[PDB]
């Protein structure tokens, strides 16, 4: 029916017959994520060492430069750059761009646009399929966490060098330095984050085990129980009342969800809310609102400080603080 | 000629290069190549045997 | 069924899948040339062209 080029293009873009839905957020998601993917793979394999701390001490993060999969990483941008925009065209040579940690900014900037567009693309397909539009809201929790460690934390700290390195061992260095400077473990938001993932892991195991325990017999013992379910079934494949009866006796009757809709909202809310707060926690600690500091909180009658477990944590925090970025500090306070 | 033999080593380096500045890493187990190859092919073959058997019926 | 040495004879009279099969060998040959060059560039030492 449509004869105009744009009318035909817009029909193809929003077409739900494509193998992978594109949509209008996809014309932003696909080019940005492919750009970040291409440079990430190339940089993870063959990028030269990067002077991350701005002290002319390059750090090797590539496979072809002596790293394995665990220790390989895309090194963050140089501390000399700071938060300044460093596209490849602002560098005199591509060798200089690689030396100063250019690929990190290219990945992070295009990746942030990709996940934001991926979130919108999740809404768009739901609208095209006529379903309720809040899977994207649940996806905002991991997006916030990714945005916090790649954008907001570098923003508050003043440098992209303080972002999370794009690597496995680089991630661990990010966490350890983060504990030493902010005491993230004592922050109530990582506490909520831990309850979000420990609880989410618990609820996933319980919901999965309770549904599996209640499968209605539809197969023999020489076949997988999965065969008892046919894709497109109009009837239920497990007995919800039986599962509620088991969990009702397990703790007590009113500690169990009799409602599948309430149960599944709880399965979604608990991890999403938990990840929202731990994402906020990193964002708040980006502006140096650190976790609880109970050092020397307990003192005896004469004033002698009685140590607690918090003070032992401070001893570990002290060790990381005096060792991270060994040659980078000329002055006693780590204000940056 | 041993003076000239060591003259080149202290001078411009020898050949065959190495990935990046240095990637010899001779400490690498090398037996890990066989371990990685055997851990890939043996289970992969097991899975492919079952799938092709299944896909043909 | 077909003997193992006659498997690739299915595209004998299938012009569309003959092109696909010849596009695959071409993909592998081109992929080898790029892989071979990258491997050689990782080993080649250009410091001493004369000796």
């Amino acid at each position: 029916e449509s004869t105009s080029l744009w009318a035909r293009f817009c029909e193809w873009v929003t077409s739900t017959e494509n193998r992978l839905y594109i949509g209008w957020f996809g014309v932003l998601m696909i080019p940005t994520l492919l750009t970040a993917t291409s440079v990430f793979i190339i940089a993870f394999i063959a990028a030269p060492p990067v002077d991350i701390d701005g002290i002319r001490e390059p750090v090797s993060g590539s496979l072809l430069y002596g790293n394995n999969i665990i220790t390989g990483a895309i090194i963050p941008t140089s501390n000399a750059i700071g938060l300044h925009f460093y596209p490849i065209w602002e560098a005199a040579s591509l060798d200089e761009w690689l030396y100063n940690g250019g690929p990190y900014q290219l990945i992070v900037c295009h990746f942030f646009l990709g996940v934001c567009s991926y979130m919108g693309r999740e809404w768009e397909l739901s609208f095209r399929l006529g379903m309720r539009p809040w899977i994207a809201v649940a996806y905002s929790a991991p997006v916030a966490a990714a945005t916090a460690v790649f954008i907001i934390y570098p923003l508050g700290q003043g440098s992209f060098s303080d972002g999370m390195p794009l690597g496995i061992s680089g991630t661990f260095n990010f966490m350890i330095v983060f504990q030493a400077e902010h005491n993230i473990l004592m922050h109530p938001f990582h506490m909520l984050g831990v309850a979000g993932v420990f609880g989410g892991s618990l609820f996933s195991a319980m919901h999965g085990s309770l549904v599996t325990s209640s499968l209605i017999r539809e197969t023999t013992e020489n076949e997988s129980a999965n065969e008892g379910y046919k894709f497109g079934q109009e009837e239920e494949t497990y007995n919800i009342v039986a599962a509620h009866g088991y969990f009702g006796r397990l703790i007590f009757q009113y500690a169990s969800f009799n409602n599948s809709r309430s149960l599944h909202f709880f399965l979604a809310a608990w991890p999403v809310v938990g990840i929202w707060f731990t994402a906020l926690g990193i964002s708040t600690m980006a502006f140096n609102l650190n976790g609880f500091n109970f050092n020397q909180s307990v003192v005896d009658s004469q004033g002698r400080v009685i140590n607690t477990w918090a003070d032992i944590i401070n001893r570990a925090n002290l060790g990381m603080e005096v060792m991270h970025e060994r040659n980078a500090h000329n002055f006693p306070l780590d204000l940056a | 000629x041993x003076x000239x033999x060591x003259x080149x080593x202290x001078x411009x380096x020898x050949x065959x290069x190495x990935x990046x500045x240095x990637x010899x890493x001779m400490e690498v187990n090398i037996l890990g190549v066989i371990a990685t190859a055997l851990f890939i092919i043996i289970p992969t073959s097991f899975l492919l045997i079952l799938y092709v058997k299944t896909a043909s019926q | 069924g077909l003997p193992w040495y006659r498997v690739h004879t299915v595209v004998l009279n299938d012009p569309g899948r003959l092109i696909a099969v010849h596009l695959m060998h071409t993909s592998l040959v081109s992929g080898w040339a790029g892989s071979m060059a990258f491997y050689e560039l990782a080993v080649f030492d250009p410091s001493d062209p004369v000796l």
Binding site: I45, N68, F231 | G32 | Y39
Partner: peptide
């Protein structure tokens, strides 16, 4: 030589990902 193994393992995993998406068994209604 380890770099060869690491790169092959990574691109091998991405190869499986590509095939799992496009060369999958289509979900057919009953």
């Amino acid at each position: 030589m380890e770099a060869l193994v690491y790169t092959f393992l990574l691109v091998g995993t991405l190869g499986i990902i590509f095939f799992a998406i496009f060369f999958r068994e289509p979900p057919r209604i009953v």
